[PDB]
Design a protein around this ligand. Structure first.
Ligand SMILES: [Zn+2]
Lengths: 470, 229
């Protein structure tokens, strides 16, 4: 079955793995952490032994049963490890701790009479009928009698490509928690896959999306039900909920609660809140289902776009490049892809929007339509360019030996070959500073800033700073 | 003693739940690449035997470490991969569960006789994405990188580090290739060019240092001028 079940820590939205707001560092460096900043210099790393994973333990067990605690998701065991290396620098969405992906080997029957059910050493074989639609919609294909291995989840779908790990490569992991202080493991890599272009199953939310704004309210419903289920009182105080929203004052805290609870003026319950029974109390176990880990991960992908947008606004002197990023914002891009998937729009397929820089990927930017016989002509060229790009894409990622299969492995991208290093004005920044110092004479320094990235940042602050008005 | 991590109010979705783990398991990791020496075959055997006594790693610096294998001492540099790598585990062969992400590689370079040779070492197939394409103004960039360089948790530089300060702060740490074959030279080949996060951080600091000097002065003024002079 293609039904996705995550581990328990994932469903629980376990802290610190899942947060309401991540620091901007983790937005700026997305799923990219500095391992060297968290090891104290002089530390001697000695490797510990792997905990044996009994086959009987996970035999005929569900995911959440197989992984009940964060300790079940350790790399400090003998369970095979799969490394999914993303070809995209900025994939649509990634998975957070505990979340499950399905490795699906799609096989399509050559004919109705096809009895074959091919098995690859890893992943689950899923048979596609002859008239069955493509798992990659109209942008990818599984040919009859062919297998196309695929990364499957509720957020994205992407082709994967198994490769050999260099015999020099190993996985060094650092583990701590469960009453135990940090220790290290050194493992062989069982499997290595290159993940192809990520195709969104679901849109990435926008900044002012009602889906995002409503999460704050849902996080409240959440806590309210939990507190109620604990005391059974059906009448509680607004005091223990307020500590979960340190930013909000008495007025805000009250206002937010009245979307759910009503105030008791007179009685034994006076000075307390009962929930309007227009809302039905959920048990604690079903209260977890109110927010999915996919939902959170989707918002972080959104916040990454937002962070990169404002990181560009301040520091990017390149007008043309800045404008490109604005057109590549994930909430837009992903949306247009879902449209094109429903024949409600089209994508450019090539050019600047291609995340590869060569022709080895898809551009998701929107293009116009599409007369009568002229649209059938354009459609044919469209459907052809798609298939053309798809096979170039999959062939490019199926490369075992770079130097023999690639045209020029050491070639340089268009966008990496020619970069704009100067302003439009070709000007620089001259700063004159007068600082009374030395316990004496006023000193004057004159400074020149040749870095257009700094120049742009300096001005933008000064510009907004120059306003103390209104 | 085991230090139980403190939760900050308003930062969690699992608050008020009973299922809460007090001390959850947090894991991080990087790729470790060693040279195709006769010690590679030693490592393979070690992992097979389960005997890890012949392998140790001394971390000397944020990006510099010493990998001793079978009494042979290796200089290693921690480099940033252009790709993000999801580490998954599976008991199913079918259902893959996410643990942590890998975006770095500890890269063995050459055998060394003394530990402080690592700082003089240069990581192959690496560049400096703060400087690249801006090599004209690289003099202006470097002196800021020397200033900004700090030790563990923002600590002042060691006597060791300050000696090799020029090498440490100015060498490239940004690796060219992914670990998978198709992603060879992916950064220069198969990436459409974007602003680098480590680049943005640098730009941000420079802007800040310039404004902090503006407050420390009495009268200040800035003007956009032509390249002369
Ligand atoms: Zn601990």
């Amino acid at each position: 079955n293609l039904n996705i079940q995550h581990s328990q820590p994932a469903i629980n939205l376990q802290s610190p793995f899942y947060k309401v707001a991540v620091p901007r560092y983790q937005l700026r460096h997305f799923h990219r952490e500095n391992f060297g900043s968290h090891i104290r210099p002089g530390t001697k790393i000695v490797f510990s032994k792997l905990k044996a994973r009994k086959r009987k333990r996970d035999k005929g067990k569900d995911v959440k049963e197989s992984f009940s605690t964060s300790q079940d998701l350790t790399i400090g065991d003998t369970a095979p490890v799969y490394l999914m290396e993303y070809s995209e620098q900025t994939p649509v969405a990634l998975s957070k701790f505990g979340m499950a992906n399905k490795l699906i080997n799609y096989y399509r029957k050559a004919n109705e009479q096809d009895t074959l059910r091919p098995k690859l050493p890893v992943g689950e074989t899923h048979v596609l009928g002859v008239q069955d639609k493509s798992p990659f919609w109209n942008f990818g294909f599984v040919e009859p009698g062919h297998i196309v291995p695929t990364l499957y989840n509720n957020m994205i779908r992407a082709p994967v490509f198994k490769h050999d790990i260099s015999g020099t490569d190993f996985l060094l992991t650092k583990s701590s928690g469960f009453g135990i202080s940090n220790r290290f493991y050194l493992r062989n890599i069982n499997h290595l896959f290159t993940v192809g272009q990520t195709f969104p199953v679901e849109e990435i939310p926008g900044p002012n999306s009602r889906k995002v704004t409503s999460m704050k309210a849902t996080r409240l419903k959440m806590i309210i039900y939990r507190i109620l289920n604990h005391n059974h009182s059906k009448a509680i105080s607004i005091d223990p909920i307020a500590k979960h929203f340190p930013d909000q004052d008495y007025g805000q805290n009250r206002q937010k609660v009245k979307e759910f609870m009503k105030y008791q003026r007179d009685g034994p319950e006076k000075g307390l809140w009962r929930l309007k029974d227009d809302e039905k109390l959920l048990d604690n176990e079903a209260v977890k289902s109110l927010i999915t880990p996919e939902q959170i991960s989707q918002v972080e992908s959104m916040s990454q776009g937002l962070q990169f947008q404002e990181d560009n606004e301040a520091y990017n002197f390149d007008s043309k490049l800045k404008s490109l990023e604005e057109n590549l914002l994930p909430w837009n891009i992903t949306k247009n892809f879902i449209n094109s998937t429903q024949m409600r729009a089209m994508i450019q397929i090539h050019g600047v929007g291609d995340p590869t820089g060569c022709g080895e990927g898809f551009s998701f930017l929107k293009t116009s339509m599409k007369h009568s016989y002229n649209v059938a002509q354009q459609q044919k060229a469209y459907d052809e360019e798609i298939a053309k790009t798809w096979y170039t894409h999959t062939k490019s990622l199926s490369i075992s030996n770079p130097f023999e299969e690639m045209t020029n492995p050491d070639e340089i991208n268009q966008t990496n070959k020619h970069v704009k290093t100067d302003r439009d004005d070709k000007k620089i920044l001259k700063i004159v500073r007068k600082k009374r110092d030395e316990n004496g004479i006023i000193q004057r320094q004159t400074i020149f800033i040749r870095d257009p990235r700094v120049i742009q940042g300096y001005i933008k602050i000064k510009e907004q700073d120059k306003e103390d008005v209104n | 003693l085991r230090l139980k991590p403190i939760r900050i109010p308003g930062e969690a979705y699992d608050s008020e739940a009973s299922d809460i783990e007090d001390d959850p398991l947090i894991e991080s990791g990087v790729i470790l690449r060693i040279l195709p020496d006769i010690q590679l075959e030693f490592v393979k055997n070690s992992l097979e035997s389960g005997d890890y006594s012949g392998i140790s790693i001394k971390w000397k610096n944020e990006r510099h470490a010493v990998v001793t294998i079978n009494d042979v001492m290796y200089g290693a540099i921690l480099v940033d991969l252009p790709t993000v790598i999801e580490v998954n585990k599976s008991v199913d062969r079918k259902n893959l569960l996410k643990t942590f992400d890998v975006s770095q590689m500890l890269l063995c370079i050459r055998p060394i006789q003394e530990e402080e040779e690592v700082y003089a070492l240069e990581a192959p197939d690496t560049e400096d994405l703060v400087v690249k394409h801006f090599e004209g103004i690289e003099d202006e960039i470097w002196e800021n990188k020397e200033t900004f360089l700090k030790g563990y948790n923002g600590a002042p530089l060691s006597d060791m580090e300050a000696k090799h300060l020029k090498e440490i702060a100015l060498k490239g740490y940004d690796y060219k290739h992914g670990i998978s074959p198709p992603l060879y030279n992916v950064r220069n080949r198969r990436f459409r060019r974007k602003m680098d996060p480590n680049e943005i951080d640098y730009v941000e600091k420079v802007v800040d240092m310039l404004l902090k000097q503006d407050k420390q002065a009495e009268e200040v003024s800035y003007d956009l001028v032509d390249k002369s002079e």
